[PDB]
């Protein structure tokens, strides 16, 4: 969908109408704590909105905005994990990009920083509603066909029209009691925008395409809007449930892929060009290493990426993982100097690391961050 770096455009309105719904479908009977935090999230209302937009605007390793798009027909044909993964980073989808976002904002609302968590979200929802706009879940870019932009162009200027303000249920109802069933968030967030976004990609191949009429469009743009407001709506709902009801989550969890979130430095050379890798040591003295590498241009000052790791050993808890590191590569003489700011890595939902560095790295260097 579109949006503008104001925290404006078709973005912001599904996140704002997202809060706005959740409001109206909150039944009664809620826990008075799930209301004390709605009502913290709607004080902080310009972050959500700011980070709802902030991803088409981030200067990041995406070239080509891949992370944007998400083929729900893929995540499981059931088809083995290619062989590099084992090596390399893998890169992010709008599927993903969700999960990544919504650990960090639990993670900054339990440390009790509103507006940083908030604005957190706002990104996780930027990513679902990606996942569910036609083009996007059909994966036709702007490259195959003009009826990516005309599109979303049409929706955003009809965008007021595509408000709704209920899901058609209260919280007691299926729709959102369902939410709460599966104790994962993980498990449960894939499957529930995966729903969402099949149903806009067969929008792409039945209203949304070149080869349909104006009245297919706005029937498309529609049900495509309104399904991303639902969608949002159900978010917002399990993350305040996350976010109040204390529970654990279980350390006895298999750990199937690690996420780094880091941070390079802005200081004038702080970004390096040298290989970087990223790896663990477990408790049986087994150890992993991958190349950390995007689409764009890793690493760059200021900048914050993303890198996922794959696991060769599929039945590692969290606490079997001793040491982590990040490791520089150099090929000529003296290298390329590189000052990471922070690292973050998230497994299972949660953020198990936060390590501030602003520290240099020189040569061929091995930095343990655990
Ligand atoms: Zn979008
Ligand atoms: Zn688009
Ligand atoms: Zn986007």
């Given at each position: 969908?579109?949006?503008?770096?104001?925290?404006?455009?078709?973005?912001?309105?599904?996140?704002?109408?997202?809060?706005?719904?959740?409001?109206?479908?909150?039944?009664?009977?809620?826990?008075?704590?799930?209301?004390?935090?709605?009502?913290?999230?709607?004080?902080?209302?310009?972050?959500?909105?700011?980070?709802?937009?902030?991803?088409?605007?981030?200067?990041?390793?995406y070239?080509?905005?891949?992370?944007?798009?998400?083929?729900?027909?893929?995540?499981?044909?059931?088809?083995?994990?290619?062989?590099?993964?084992?090596?390399?980073?893998?890169?992010?989808?709008?599927?993903?990009?969700?999960?990544?976002?919504?650990?960090?904002a639990?993670?900054?609302?339990?440390?009790?920083?509103?507006?940083?968590?908030?604005?957190?979200?706002?990104?996780?929802?930027?990513?679902?509603?990606?996942?569910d706009?036609?083009?996007?879940?059909?994966?036709?870019?702007?490259?195959?066909?003009?009826?990516?932009?005309?599109?979303?162009?049409?929706?955003?200027?009809?965008?007021?029209?595509?408000?709704?303000?209920?899901?058609?249920?209260?919280?007691?109802?299926?729709?959102?009691?369902?939410?709460?069933?599966?104790?994962?968030?993980?498990?449960?967030?894939?499957?529930?925008?995966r729903?969402?976004?099949?149903?806009?990609?067969?929008?792409?191949?039945?209203?949304?395409?070149?080869?349909?009429?104006?009245?297919?469009?706005?029937?498309?743009?529609?049900?495509?809007?309104?399904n991303?407001?639902?969608?949002?709506?159900?978010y917002?709902?399990?993350?305040?449930?996350?976010?109040?009801?204390?529970?654990?989550?279980?350390?006895?969890?298999?750990?199937?892929?690690?996420?780094?979130?880091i941070?390079?430095?802005?200081?004038?050379?702080?970004?390096?060009?040298?290989?970087?890798?990223?790896?663990?040591?477990?408790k049986?003295?087994?150890?992993?290493?991958?190349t950390?590498?995007?689409?764009?241009?890793?690493?760059?000052?200021?900048?914050?990426?993303?890198?996922?790791?794959?696991?060769?050993?599929?039945?590692?808890?969290?606490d079997?993982?001793?040491?982590?590191?990040?490791?520089?590569?150099?090929?000529?003489?003296?290298?390329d100097?590189?000052?990471?700011?922070?690292?973050?890595?998230?497994?299972?939902?949660?953020?198990?690391?936060?390590?501030?560095?602003?520290?240099?790295?020189?040569?061929?260097?091995?930095?343990?961050?655990?």
């Amino acid at each position: 969908w579109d949006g503008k770096a104001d925290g404006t455009g078709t973005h912001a309105m599904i996140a704002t109408q997202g809060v706005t719904i959740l409001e109206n479908d909150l039944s009664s009977n809620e826990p008075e704590v799930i209301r004390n935090n709605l009502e913290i999230l709607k004080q902080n209302m310009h972050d959500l909105q700011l980070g709802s937009t902030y991803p088409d605007y981030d200067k990041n390793a995406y070239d080509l905005y891949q992370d944007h798009f998400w083929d729900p027909d893929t995540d499981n044909n059931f088809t083995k994990d290619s062989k590099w993964y084992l090596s390399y980073s893998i890169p992010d989808t709008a599927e993903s990009q969700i999960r990544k976002f919504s650990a960090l904002a639990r993670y900054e609302w339990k440390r009790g920083n509103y507006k940083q968590a908030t604005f957190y979200l706002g990104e996780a929802m930027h990513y679902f509603g990606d996942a569910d706009t036609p083009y996007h879940a059909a994966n036709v870019t702007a490259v195959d066909s003009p009826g990516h932009v005309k599109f979303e162009t049409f929706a955003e200027d009809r965008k007021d029209q595509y408000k709704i303000n209920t899901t058609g249920s209260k919280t007691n109802d299926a729709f959102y009691s369902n939410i709460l069933t599966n104790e994962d968030f993980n498990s449960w967030s894939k499957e529930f925008a995966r729903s969402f976004a099949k149903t806009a990609k067969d929008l792409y191949y039945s209203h949304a395409n070149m080869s349909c009429s104006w009245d297919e469009w706005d029937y498309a743009a529609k049900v495509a809007l309104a399904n991303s407001q639902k969608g949002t709506s159900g978010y917002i709902y399990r993350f305040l449930h996350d976010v109040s009801d204390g529970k654990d989550s279980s350390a006895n969890k298999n750990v199937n892929e690690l996420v780094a979130y880091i941070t390079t430095g802005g200081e004038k050379y702080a970004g390096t060009d040298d290989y970087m890798y990223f790896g663990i040591k477990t408790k049986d003295g087994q150890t992993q290493e991958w190349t950390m590498d995007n689409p764009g241009n890793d690493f760059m000052t200021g900048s914050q990426d993303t890198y996922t790791f794959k696991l060769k050993d599929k039945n590692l808890k969290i606490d079997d993982i001793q040491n982590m590191w990040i490791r520089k590569s150099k090929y000529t003489e003296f290298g390329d100097d590189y000052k990471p700011a922070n690292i973050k890595v998230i497994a299972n939902g949660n953020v198990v690391l936060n390590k501030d560095i602003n520290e240099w790295i020189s040569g061929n260097s091995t930095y343990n961050i655990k």
